[PDB]
Design a protein around this ligand. Structure first.
Ligand SMILES: Nc1ccn([C@@H]2O[C@H](COP(=O)(O)O)[C@@H](O)[C@H]2O)c(=O)n1
Ligand SMILES: *[C@@H]1O[C@H](CO)[C@@H](O)[C@H](O)[C@H]1NC(C)=O
Ligand SMILES: *[C@@H]1O[C@H](CO)[C@@H](O)[C@H](O)[C@H]1NC(C)=O
Length: 294
């Protein structure tokens, strides 16, 4: 059944030579080699770990030793995914039923659900975030409903390796101990992610996957530049799912809607939103991506 989105990829030459369904999406222990440490130490930002201590990175990556840390999905069924961006287009879209009908749902950053479920749904299978944006969302959108990140029995949290805080928070979450060092010292991972503290709950996006995404799909002339978390998440789904629908992502008529679907009234890092919008348009036209528009 996978040959649904894969067929669309091959039928058009442009993306046929741009997709590489072999690069690892997730970083885990069996990939931590002194070779990888050499290269990735020459890149900062989420593209590597220059200036980050071996002790921290080695200690976190030692928890990702299990085979389950390597993949988002476990092993003949079809994988139908929905990626929920936070754009104002979903406001009054009443897309809840369509979003929740998918097998798996990706959400990210300010995934406000209370008060907006009829528009955006309640199902969550994956929650992507940097520690910085997650806590910034808990501060900015607390009154709007976001009093906690989405939780679920079989929900997995996807860490974007944008800063040493992400490794520290990832390491503390798997161990089930409060974060001992760094900017987030004192936080309780259980209060963010719930009672389960295992490697089956928390995953880490591969820095080489992010570099490959930037280089092949979103190499903006702004080149620190990096794609939006939504873009990262959407592209993560494009590489792991058999069909993905995108909701709440920036479109050409973005100006008709508030900044976010959950803002109080109409509201207006280094990203190229115009490039990302053009990517989702081309993916839509090539039939690779179902993009929600109106
Ligand atoms: N107007 C908007 C708002 C958000 N988005 C997507 O939703 C993601 C999450 O938004 P926030 O980080 O504001 O919560 C963004 O990273 C972006 O990819 C969008 O594409 N257009
Ligand atoms: C896919 O990426 C891997 C690196 O992970 C590389 O070795 C391989 O040649 C690439 N294949 C294609 C078709 O781009
Ligand atoms: C659109 O969003 C604004 C704030 O984001 C909200 O006040 C308004 O009720 C929404 N309109 C709808 C859902 O028709």
């Amino acid at each position: 059944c996978r040959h649904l989105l894969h067929l669309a990829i091959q039928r058009h030459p442009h993306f046929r030579g741009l997709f590489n369904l072999s690069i690892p999406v997730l970083l885990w222990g069996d990939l931590f080699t002194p070779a990888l440490w050499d290269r990735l130490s020459q890149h900062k930002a989420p593209y590597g770990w220059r200036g980050l201590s071996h002790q921290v990175i080695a200690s976190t990556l030692s928890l990702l030793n299990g085979s389950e840390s390597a993949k988002l999905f476990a092993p003949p069924k079809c994988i139908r995914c929905a990626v929920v961006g936070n754009g104002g287009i979903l406001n009054g879209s009443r897309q809840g039923p369509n979003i929740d009908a998918h097998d798996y749902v990706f959400r990210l950053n300010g995934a406000v659900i209370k008060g907006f479920e009829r528009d955006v749904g309640t199902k969550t299978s994956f929650y992507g975030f940097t520690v910085n944006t997650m806590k910034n969302s808990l501060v900015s959108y607390w009154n709007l409903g976001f009093t906690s990140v989405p939780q679920g029995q079989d929900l997995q949290y996807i860490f974007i390796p944008s800063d040493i805080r992400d490794y520290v928070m990832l390491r503390s979450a798997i161990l089930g101990v409060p974060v001992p060092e760094g900017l987030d010292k004192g936080d309780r991972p259980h209060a963010y992610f719930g009672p389960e503290a295992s490697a089956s709950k928390f995953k880490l996006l591969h820095p080489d996957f992010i570099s490959y995404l930037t280089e092949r799909f979103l190499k903006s002339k702004l080149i620190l530049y990096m794609p939006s978390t939504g873009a990262l998440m959407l592209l993560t789904a494009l590489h792991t799912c058999d069909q993905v629908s995108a909701y709440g992502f920036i479109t050409s008529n973005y100006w008709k809607f508030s900044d976010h679907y959950f803002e109080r009234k109409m509201k207006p890092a280094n990203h190229d939103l115009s490039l990302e919008a053009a990517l989702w348009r081309d993916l839509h036209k090539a039939g690779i991506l179902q993009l929600y528009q109106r």
